[PDB]
Assembly symmetry: D2
Homo-oligomer: 255 residues x 4
């Protein structure tokens, strides 16, 4: 039973509650019928596997920041990349726009910040070994692409998310859960792949600026809807996500 949203028919009524039911329960959904055209998606997927072409190979990672004329049909990798990103930005602003109205805050509430792109290419390569470490995107949102077929933690159990072609996974980042007042949830995920199978993924990451500090949202607290999160500065927030105190499954074992 997996949440799907249609980018059209949002501003809808039902597809707009579908967003809500999706963001509260799972913190993620997969968005179909957006604006990006399948012609562009496959080329980003494929120009990517191309850009990366005993001793065998397990993965390739590049992550890099975005932020003449330009072809209505791009074809250079440095150019096809740009149409999709600025295709994703529009998809994004449609999203936070719908949210701000699910939460009954002005739509304009949400505002700019830098953008990042992470490419993970997981080639085939025959073998019987699995390796990678779950994490939760500590940012605003993340818009994710996959061709060559991904899992989230809910109720301690892990469950798989079927990535289906020409559709886009979109999940919420931690700081955005703070800001939503926990009304919407930032999920936990991990990637597990089998060695000898292809898995190209390209994920857009939207962080946020040195601005008015990560605290829960303005007109969303009153006398009877208290704040679930403390007010921390954009910077104590950043150091936080890279500072760990005590944990580890190895100590889970200690006795």
């Amino acid at each position: 039973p997996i949440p799907v949203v249609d980018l059209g028919r949002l501003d809808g009524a039902e597809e707009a509650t579908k967003l809500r039911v999706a963001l509260q329960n799972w913190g993620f959904f997969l968005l179909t019928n957006h604006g990006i055209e399948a012609s562009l998606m496959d080329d980003v997927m494929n120009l990517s596997r191309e850009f990366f072409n005993q001793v065998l190979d397990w993965s390739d990672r590049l992550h890099l920041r975005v932020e003449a004329f330009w072809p209505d049909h791009p074809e250079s990798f440095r150019d096809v990349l740009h149409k999709y990103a600025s295709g994703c930005k529009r998809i994004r602003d449609d999203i936070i726009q719908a949210m701000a109205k699910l939460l009954e805050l002005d739509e304009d509430y949400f505002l700019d910040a830098p953008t990042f792109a992470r490419f993970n290419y997981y080639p085939p390569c025959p073998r019987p070994d699995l390796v990678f470490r779950p994490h939760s995107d500590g940012g605003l949102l993340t818009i994710l692409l996959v061709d060559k077929d991904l899992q989230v933690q809910r109720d301690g159990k892990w469950s798989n998310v079927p990535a289906t072609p020409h559709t886009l996974l979109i999940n919420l980042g931690d700081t955005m859960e703070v800001m939503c007042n926990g009304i919407f949830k930032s999920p936990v995920h991990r990637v597990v792949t089998n060695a000898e199978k292809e898995r190209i993924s390209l994920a857009m990451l939207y962080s946020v600026n040195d601005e008015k500090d990560i605290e829960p949202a303005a007109g969303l607290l009153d006398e009877n809807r208290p704040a679930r999160y403390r007010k921390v500065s954009v910077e104590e927030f950043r150091a936080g996500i890279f500072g760990k105190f005590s944990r580890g499954e190895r100590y889970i074992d200690s006795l």
Copy 2:
């Protein structure tokens, strides 16, 4: 305050207790005077950042390739493989040197692929710097042209030229029963400062059950750690958020 060890003078008596003092307090040390020579290490580092030399308005902050292995050449599958099997030796000289501090026969271990992690970190600006964990799987040897989590502070590890720092993985800690313990680490770097890195990670194949080592648990040297199958140990190692503090 950083232990430096010598691969020579090892066994010895002085460099042989440096390990204990290093591996018990903070899980790792920096090895000088290995078998590996600067021509080779420089050539792996320079043949490495090369695997990817041209894109602008998309600026770059990353670069990883992950690959399995198993005098001086200059094809890649070879500058690597001369380095790869040079590290294999350094691995086994401590695993020998270390079963030896444990008051057991040296050969107890000797048990399954090896992995290689490549990184390189170059951009153009200053940071929009936006993760800590512990290398959880039996010994890893690290090269660069990192910080450790002791007691609550994150004390950082100065890496010195052409030396190979080596830290223990969780699988090791469980087995020798915590006498030496696997540290926790993080990487924080500046945008506009390069750091090419090369790590060799040694895990183990589906053999043995991961349990602390038979010959060091007396009647009153009990086991502090349980036995898990190299199956659920795996599922443990891949299965809190700073948001939760609030």
Copy 3:
């Protein structure tokens, strides 16, 4: 900083939000100007130290007992004085639950039950080099408390002391009430630490709840943008839960 509510003047704009600011920050307040008469409070306290009096020295003794025709209109001697206070405390309680249900815009009648019981702890004087009883969070449904010595809460990891002042009643919310509320109001965590060589009599009314309509966050308080912070568990798996878990214990902190 110390919250106090005036029981009269409650059901009035300001003293009614004084309750809210109190229940949100720390699980408790100090209620003054209740209906109970100072004559009766002192006799409970004193008829109580009495009931327990009737190298080897004494450090504490506790009594536990459940609540529920001619009866003394006014004075008594013990076991009748107890009843006037208890059924003086039930009224104080129902006045309080009533205001809470209106602070959160839910019908007042919602809270309606179903038993009640009382814990008596008497802490005599002694010699002095030792401290034993501790921490716990009142698991249940609000508690009404009496004291005449001088009690600690664990808000913000640090521990602060609560000044217990005479002819005043300390009152805190129970665990099942934070669940029942939507976490809007909080059930505090507390401890008692006393010095050997000091008197400390305390009597706490505890109001629990019956096996009835299941512990869930409160009905008309969830809408489309007020999700529920707590799961619905049976009145029974709730009871077993509070007496059975794993945790770390300060001895494990030391494990290193």
Copy 4:
């Protein structure tokens, strides 16, 4: 699966090792053939439950507690002192007996008054039952007319008369290097069944600073626990709610 130990045979290797088998795996045992005699135990149980002569002649009953420090009889200040000082003896025979399984001289001491908890849970009405924690002292010896958390399950401890149940406290565990463990326990009753209990608790005074035991930690048997002062140890012990399952 309850280890039962004998005060007699508390050497001879046979009852001397069930003790060890009890204290490592579970943390407690039940002693038969002590020095304490049923004429006495019975009198402490009857002089105590009686400490409540006749109060009431609309308020039903839940329980009675007595908490007080200790150091021919048949006065209450005397059946206790004969009982109290019979327990001191059982304490030191065990403190001796487990100082030798630890391979050191017996003389731990560094001992630290004595405290006595009396709990009587008389009957009343049945309906409902709306403590889990660990005795964080040193040792506690229990008499009755509860449950232990072995792993995830809560398994019951059958107390049979007139034997004396005896468990380890946290500071004992810290002092060994955890070789013997401090268990966790709970009490569950139906209301309407008598349960008189008498427990003697052994703490230690503001002295020699709680750290694991000198002559048990060597080059390949490190200390698993840090040193805390009898002061900071105290504040820890009286300083996650099931509601948080949430």
